[PDB]
Symmetry: C5
Subunit: 337 residues, 5 copies
């Protein structure tokens, strides 16, 4: 019974057009649409994108196609009969690629309300492209934009607008592997201005903060500690080279293999990033040990001895102070601010 | 003969609706469904998901469409004629993507029993998304949820419920590469509460225990052993630096390259994980050797000698005791408890 | 001419059923099927599977559909008209996923013989899942099962059986990258017993022997050689530490970086595997050098000297003998036996 | 109303041919086409290609099919009715593979203007193959060609030509991970000459400059610094070997592990590339230290001492001067020029 | 006009069979086919295959379907009407998988000449499987076979044969990343002999020479140089161990980390390959240094001194001579010959 009464409305009986939008040659069609996101994942420095599947929930009413006569409330049509009725034409502007889910039954759901309101929900997996600045890598804060624009309909034809309450809803417990998702989700309108006209889009923004913990423990601390070891090598006797020169050289080598391993494990990028800066500077002080101490060892070979001891006290004071001033600038620079 | 008698029931002859569920404007439809899983694989820290193909076995009876007249028992229809009859609309809630198998013949099998019972079995490969906490990596225990929910039908429309005997059945000898599958499989109901209503889902839970063996042998033991070597470096003569300072520096370098290699082979994660904690702490004691011994070497340059020997005995007692207390806390912390 | 005479047989003219098998309500249908495999590849520890494309050759005769009237011998129908005639419903039980080849023309070939014999050959690429035990990795022998089962037809309905001569035929010169394929191919029947009944399957088994050569040369020999170097470090003077202690420490460090590199290049597995055992044990003796020699160095600081020399001779005898007994157990354990 | 009036024009009513182009047996059809590119990504040394999705905007007018009678301006037909009208047949010549986006609604948009002008815009993701010469890797400048050619229509049949204003338009803020996109985009005609005839193509060229920063900091500076350390090892006493020979040997080892790590992180290529040249040469000087110093150490064992000191001064002058001349040649060679 | 006149020929009007080949019950059909290859890429040791897209150009004439009446020369039919006419059934024998390009318009082009000649060109991307012997890796020469065979038609039914002039044509400037393509392309017939009969195939062969440059510079030279360093360690004083034993031990360690890094970067193979042989042998001499020098150091502890000096001169002469004889055998062995 509801099938045939549906066939009268959406079929060649009477009349209707899948081609023609509601209110043709009239006021512009509103689509109030809200999304419920199932998952984030695979956020890669490489392809410069993340992958997400959402439940896209669109609502719009056409004056046409509303019975008000028939006993049942709302209505439901089969995913195959989905073509018969006009749907708002929507793409995401920034995805590389997307797909429906056909698993088991088809995931396209549609309901036509008594009053003529239409609820159209589809489940879509899609890969969106987000621009990423790793300029500060460990202290990094990434912003993720998901923007939904109409395709081939100007402001005059239709408008996209968010739901008042719970427009974009994150399914809880996503626990993304490399990032934490900031609870605050900032959504706002966007407008496309082209030669052909003005087109709607709605832009959603998710703030993803990179958690630096693993990098703090695996990368920073060992290197810093090695630097302390070189500082202790500055304390070494004003006579013996091979254990002292040794301390410095060992310091250099350990620093180098550390930087090598970290350079293997980090994301591949050709622009200078924060962690790389830090590794490099640490390596620089590690060298500076053997620089000042080779200066001491060469000047050693009365006045020269006093200059060597003054260079020794000067080293002892300067290394921790310089590295402290440097830390003070660095951390405050990249973290917040 | 069974084809045409099938065409009477499922065809436009008499009447039937693929659109309309059984018992429309009536009592809610039960689907008793049980799954037989063929394989687990590719459980990745990266995409935060695993891949599995199952035989999904659904059973429900419609009062309509039951002959009882025809000589043959049950019936079978071709996978192409599958559309004619109503099927319960089901997705998995947590998969990123899924597909049917069309290989050789189509894998959708359907039988319509004499009494009007319907057995619908399909073979589906699908990638399900499981949240993973590697917070304790080596001692890790992962939980895997597979949840089957109806799409577009409220509690009033239909109910999903497990089989009484052997609801979820693991095909034996899966032997997952990185994990062991706990024989206990815990399944239970779940209920979706949304603005539109209450929807059914059935939730299956597989416990996967990570086996820590390879990490115990390749990562822990060498590092620990190196620590013992530094302990032996504490025994070294109270005079000679370069072999002793040498022992310490070598200890540091070996520790660092070990941590580097392990940092390459482990799964990539930006939050601090157990194995990383352990590596780091070991590296810390490795340093502490050269710290205490540089304290000794500097204080060495009557009372100072006694303080050096007391620092030597204190080192000999403290290092094994501190590392023992630490192990005692650590292992009990992450393993079970 | 053969097209229309084909249309009489397989068409609505006269009668036939794609739905209904041959000999319905009668004796069970034999399908004699043999496969010719084109390629093996991508055998991964990771996904626990290999990829193979085969020519699947099925033969069965239906009493129906046999002309015997028409002049031409056999017959051929277009891949699109393939649906008209009944085909035996077959899946592979263990694949994750599979596909036809549509490249250029369609690869489904079918011939209907004069006597009523049917030859149906299709080209299929598919990814089969094989359980792998790397418990012994270098000396490893893998077994690969390809099993073909009927889908939705009990023993009463049909039977699968191999060809008498050349049932499974390997296309020569496959030269798999990491494995060698044992010429002996062992195929045998298998029977599925389920609540619904008994179903046929034919199981093919390929023995793949892993060739250990690259691991013998790149991993074992250097490590073993390093162990010999430590043995030579046992010969070192009973006086001087830094070159001797040095020899030992260097031995340890080289061993560690070797184990690290090998730990990067090997397949990722969380259960203890043979090569890992071996690496670890070697590292253990490498340590044992510095253990016994630190015992000597500490006991050195009349009777103590004699105990040191006795520990020296004891070391010289024990290390090669212990490592020899160990090799004797190990190699015989994992290789064959 | 516009649907049926569209059906008169593009339908069997009156006449039209999807098969037959405009102006058949007449003047050649112009297609003015401009592209707006959404994203670049995944530019891999490996597959020798990049991935891009564009909005392809084609414009051509057919004398046929232009109403001029009907009140509405332009027109729009559904993506399914797209086949009815003739479209210019276009491939990209260099892609490995490509696809449409079907997500939500179909992304093919078409408008038929009153005058008979046709605007056809489609959204296409496609993977284009660009030849890459890494002969100079760090200082590298890559050129990316996107070429659009007609398929099966000679110069006599149709012509492709760019838009006058804003033919190829980059969507701002692409921020490709490993490269920077030069704002200058050079597009020009190309002509295919084959045995069958002459075919049109339009060729677009994007200049991508590789930014060498990360390689300057992570690879060059540490190595160079190590070289300086060996220079300082030339200053070492004319007597003592083990700290000096030590300095050299340590220099060699650090250099080697640096080259190893960099050899892991760089793109895999079997032809000699710039960064590799540089690493190798640095390693060569690092050796040259121990070469000249072993010459000194051997000649040391009156005149021989003077030759050793002269070799010492000669080393001190030559190493920085040779390495400076080398840098002067190298950097100017690969960067610009 | 040409559309309908095409419909007479290829349509049910008059008669024609897509099923039935030209000259049925007659002389065998020739297809002269030549390919123009667009790209090579992704040649992987792993999957044992390469990926290529070609323009496949087939030509054959059917006596049927030739008008000779109609004014226009040749003809063109739409890719959708491609089914109406018979096409030669062709697969590539060795591909794992393949696909058409549907991007923008369909890439299948067909022309039916006045005389009844048929030109059928299609653009196909496909992944072909080539057997690879890395037995000699750096000096490697790979051969790539592309073989095109008819599917389901015996020698009696049809024949495949190359074009006389320019049968296989490489699009210039392919510049494959790891290989160079030898300009000489050797194509020849191949014949399939099976139980069912004899089938045609045409086999094309591309010679790909691996360029060893990057391996010569990054792998060989550093190792060899290290060996020279050990040779220089043979010159070291007949008294002092720790710098000399040191030189040897350092030599060993650097060699080991070099072999480790190279073992990470090379393609993964379980059979012994040339570069591995070389690395191993070099490591062997590196050891042999400490072997002979430990022999000297132990025999040192009148006649014994003379034996030590004779072992010293013997070492100095033997190492370069043995390594030279070895190089002489090795390089000539793997390169050419
Ligand atoms: O003519 C154009 C080209 C232009 O390309 C950049 C991206 C676009 C996305 N939407 C949908 C198609 C478009 C549009 C709508 C109606 C007529 C012509 C037309 N377009 C594209 C246009 C923009 C904006 C708009
Ligand atoms: O209006 C909605 C949106 C909402 O999105 C979050 C996830 C959902 C999954 N199932 C199937 C679709 C839905 C539903 C059923 C019937 C009418 C409307 C409707 N939906 C979604 C809804 C939930 C729950 C339910
Ligand atoms: O009811 C079932 C479920 C069960 O699932 C595990 C795997 C199976 C594979 N084949 C094809 C489908 C099945 C079968 C045939 C006819 C009626 C019911 C039915 N099945 C599955 C069954 C097994 C065995 C058999
Ligand atoms: O006969 C051919 C083969 C040749 O192959 C190399 C690449 C080609 C791409 N376009 C489209 C097909 C082609 C063409 C057009 C009309 C008749 C025959 C024909 N072709 C190919 C040709 C070229 C150029 C042109
Ligand atoms: O009966 C067979 C099996 C056999 O399998 C190995 C590979 C083959 C490829 N081509 C196309 C199909 C085949 C063929 C043609 C006509 C009748 C039967 C038939 N086949 C396969 C055959 C070979 C050779 C040939």
């Amino acid at each position: 019974a509801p099938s045939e009464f549906l066939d009268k409305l959406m079929g060649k009986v009477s009349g209707y057009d899948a081609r023609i939008r509601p209110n043709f040659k009239g006021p512009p069609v509103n689509v109030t649409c809200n999304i419920f996101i199932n998952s984030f994942g695979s956020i890669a420095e490489t392809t410069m994108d993340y992958r997400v599947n959402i439940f896209l929930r669109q609502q719009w009413n056409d004056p046409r196609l509303a019975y008000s006569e028939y006993p049942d409330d709302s209505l439901d049509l089969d995913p195959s009969m989905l073509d018969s009725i006009w749907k708002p034409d929507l793409f995401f502007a920034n995805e590389k690629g997307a797909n429906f889910h056909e698993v088991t039954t088809d995931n396209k759901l549609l309901r036509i309300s008594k009053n003529g309101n239409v609820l159209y929900s589809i489940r879509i997996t899609l890969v969106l492209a987000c621009p990423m600045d790793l300029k500060n890598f460990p202290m990094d804060v990434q912003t993720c934009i998901m923007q939904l624009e109409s395709f081939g309909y100007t402001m005059n034809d239709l408008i996209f607008e968010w739901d008042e309450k719970g427009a974009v809803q994150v399914a809880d417990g996503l626990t993304l592997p490399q990032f934490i998702l900031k609870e605050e989700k900032d959504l706002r309108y966007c407008t496309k201005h082209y030669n052909t006209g003005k087109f709607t889009c709605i832009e959603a923004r998710f703030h993803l903060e990179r958690q630096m913990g693993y990098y703090l423990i695996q990368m920073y601390i060992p290197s810093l500690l090695i630097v302390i070891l070189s500082w202790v090598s500055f304390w070494i006797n004003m006579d013996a080279a091979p254990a002292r020169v040794g301390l410095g050289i060992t310091t250099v080598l350990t620093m180098t293999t550390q930087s090598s391993g970290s350079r293997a494990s980090l994301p591949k990028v050709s622009y200078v990033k924060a962690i790389d800066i830090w590794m490099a500077v640490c390596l620089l002080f590690v060298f500076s040990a053997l620089l000042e101490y080779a200066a001491v060892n060469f000047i050693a070979r009365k006045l020269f001895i006093s200059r060597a001891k003054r260079i020794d006290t000067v080293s002892r004071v300067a290394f921790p102070l310089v590295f402290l001033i440097f830390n003070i600038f660095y951390w405050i620079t990249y973290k917040l601010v």
